């Protein structure tokens, strides 16, 4: 096969891939670079990534990069052969490296040499562990030998291998970026046939990933397979005549971009349970009213990250974040995404149901992992929704998960975040009081920004922005409903415009421009979720 | 390699290193010192330290210290070789020592000979255990043989090895001191090239560690590696032309001190979860008002530790400590650090969220470990913040962690501390009543010092101290806001001066001197967190 694993295969790993390649090649082409400054390159390296992220693929490309002799050793077969000859085999590879040195010691998907740090007492497991530690020991500075590895679990590997002088440098490659997803799906398109250069399809492939925040590379490379198999069904019967494929019609059946759109289903993506990063596309234009908060909230979040220097000339402490509180449906979930979306900085999404929900929850650490993933990805703004559920007051809930896993965990995490650090915490919840008052302590959350319900005058703006996609009638006027009622939120009016469609649809089977009457009947169909009684609740709850 | 492991490599271990060296060398150069007085030096010794603290390194230096024949035996490879030949190998080393005696029996990172005290029943594990106990047994008084070892877990080693006559003396080296951190980072600078003697950089290196309380030595030695790798990236492309390094530009690329500042990130320090020691730099000048409390609190803490003798001439019992209670934001967290910071005595920091939070919390022992780390490090003052969370009243919380791990544990710990002992307990919490009244029993906490909210007259001082770093306007006067409102704490005014910057920034894009109006608009932006209603709460809560 003239075509072999090369860089162009990998995609979206450019920063990580670049660093790994640089370490190997700079050390590999010649030691003189590291030989002169700093220690020789660390022999062992661990590539920690979610499964099916391409780690296995990375090593081959690395091997082709400097031309060093390729070797690949796998945990599944490391101990494959019968016990007592396993150890001999492990030693043999190390012996093998010097002959072709400079060479690359290559093994992947290794849970076998270190099945568990302290849990497994098996001798076959133990013997290999020992030899490995020693081979690491048997490795010498002169040798152009590089050791590599990947694993599903970061800490699943032995802790001891962690001390430096063995596995000193580790780089973990995560899910590919939205633009990175294209590279993966783009390359496989080469074999994939579309009939034309189809830069639009390329642009189509661009959006193909955008249909979801992202997935694992492996599954993505499998997604393209779905289209082939699936799309092949339509043209498959015509060939049932005989076994040999007719040359009359040969490769004139091409997978249509719609095939993928039909292929995305049934492929059961989202095999990754790891913390994810997502950037929403919402824009302030989608935000009606609230000119004051947006203008101030923006300068609050944007200033520290975008203009840190000008913020230091004053000297006041930078903000660790702020919390949002108001009537349900004021758009908290929508606002945060806006500021986060507007800012280039990476975004992170946290859900109160999901935090208990996302993992076993036996350990609420996921949250402690959030900042770690957030800190590394900084500058970024972390978002926590329904922080109350996540951090209910301590007395109310008799559970380990509520207090032990998170509320206690939460105070510690906030201190860790730093102003220089590009991390920022934006909370939103229905009832501020429900959450532990401990979070309102000075320095944990600087200010509490209340979101007032949409004003009738603001209603005039809130309505157009949402119905812009909706076809409207020439006679129907939006401001009418605004002047009618002062009690409706944005969330209720959300469904309000929603129900209007049903009303307009109910009269006429085929869709037509909505009518003012279509709002009135629906206007009384859903009453305001916010009365003058609750407004006082927050007005008083604004102090605590 | 002419350069080999020597004392100068180690740093910050001077007391511990000195003691170990003395034990080996005094015994090693000649027995006559110990031979005449006291028993011969204990053959076995265990060096207990957090991982990556340099323990491994210590043995080599010790070996070079008296010139005794070096031998190093490691747990990873102790049992490395196939079972049934492992035991023979262990015996062989002991046999080996006499030939070159005086010699040093040297093995490190040993969990293998004693994988677990009672948990592991493996024969290979057991056989070695037995031989080890016996070799300890086979060791004889005449022999100039010294046995050493390190482990992550102190009690992880077998309990039996603990009885004297085997492993009698143990010294554990912890995290290096702030000044000690310099030694580590300083020595590696030798290979590290800066272009000049750069005593400033040395002073720069001085502060390099001060950016954080501290870390593990190993990681620190790795930190310098980050700069090399990271800093090498800027000058790395220019060499892409060919593999051989051009002699035209040779070592004219030097790591800049800013590189480290850029290197500190991404290095994921703080791999140590052990109890830590930190000394804050706060000074009373940073403390506005409260002339009475500081003057009295100082004489309360300082007197016993600094002037114990003059305190004994009276004869009254010394103080085990005292508790602080007052409105949130009165500066409790700030005051304690001040007195602790002012005093040379080492400081310890305890957080209520963190204590549940810091470890699994299944065992609240960490706290019992606190004093142990505190007692050994005395004279020092232990600090517990939000003692309520840590020690809520027993009836309110239905949890094992709250009562079993700590409140019950707490009473026992206090008795252990002694007046001669330089340990002192300074508590602070929002609500004294919330904590178990059991802590107010006589002798546990002598007095309860209430911190009154900042007085308007004191406000005049509180404001300047905080804004000293802030550029101010010639017309703007500080006392104005003081005479306006009697209800603001220090913590709220904290943000108050904070929000002022935003106000001043909001008008003018580039930062300029603040204006009186900038305070007024913000003055009403945040109302006092303490009204005349809460003051009565503490006024009455002052009795219990
Ligand atoms: N960024 C990427 N670039 C190219 N291929 C990728 C990428 N990520 C995943 N893959 C795909 O993964 C498949 C090979 O298996 P994979 O890469 O999953 O092994 P690995 O990720 O190294 O180890 P594991 O399979 O255990 O995760 C290839 O078909 C390859 O196209
Ligand atoms: N300023 C606004 N501009 C446009 N739409 C808004 C605005 N505020 C709220 N909405 C509407 O509210 C709907 C959902 O908001 P949501 O209820 O998620 O906010 P929230 O109630 O603060 O968050 P949560 O529901 O998680 O408590 C959106 O569909 C949006 O149309
Ligand atoms: N105080 C110190 N002085 C000099 N080097 C140190 C110190 N603390 C840690 N190190 C570094 O540790 C590295 C060697 O490994 P290390 O010292 O961590 O082994 P160990 O601490 O004896 O055992 P473990 O690695 O299991 O903790 C060396 O690069 C050394 O510079
Ligand atoms: N005497 C003082 N001088 C200067 N600043 C003070 C003083 N008292 C309080 N402060 C201000 O209070 C802020 C934080 O104090 P903090 O709220 O931590 O004290 P506390 O409320 O007693 O402790 P905790 O918040 O843990 O209950 C500091 O930034 C400081 O500026």
Residue numbers in the entry:
A (entry chain A), B (entry chain C): 183 to 726
Q: What does the publication say?
A:
The 83 kDa VAT protein, which is composed of an N-terminal regulatory domain (NTD) and two tandem nucleotide-binding AAA+ domains (NBD1 and NBD2), assembles into a 500 kDa homohexamer. Truncation of the first 182 residues of VAT removes the regulatory NTD, producing a construct (ΔN-VAT) that has both higher ATPase and unfoldase activity than the intact protein. All AAA+ unfoldases have conserved sequences that extend from the NBDs towards the center of the ring, forming ‘pore loops’ that are essential for unfolding substrate.
Single particle cryo-EM analysis was performed, excluding the fibrils by inspecting micrographs after automatic particle selection and manually deselecting particle images that were part of a filament. First, removal of the NTDs in ΔN-VAT makes the complex more structurally homogeneous and allowed specimens to be prepared with thinner ice than could be used with full length VAT. In the structure, a central pore runs along the six-fold symmetry axis of the complex through the center of the stacked NBD1 and NBD2 rings (left, hexagon). In the six-fold symmetric VAT structure, pore loop 1 of NBD1, containing conserved and essential tyrosine residues (Tyr264 and Tyr265), forms an opening that is ~28 Å across while pore loop 2 of NBD1 (residues 299 to 305) forms a slightly tighter aperture that is ~18 Å across (left). Similar apertures are produced by the corresponding pore loop 1 of NBD2 (containing conserved residues Trp 541 and Val 542) and pore loop 2 of NBD2 (residues 575–579) (left).
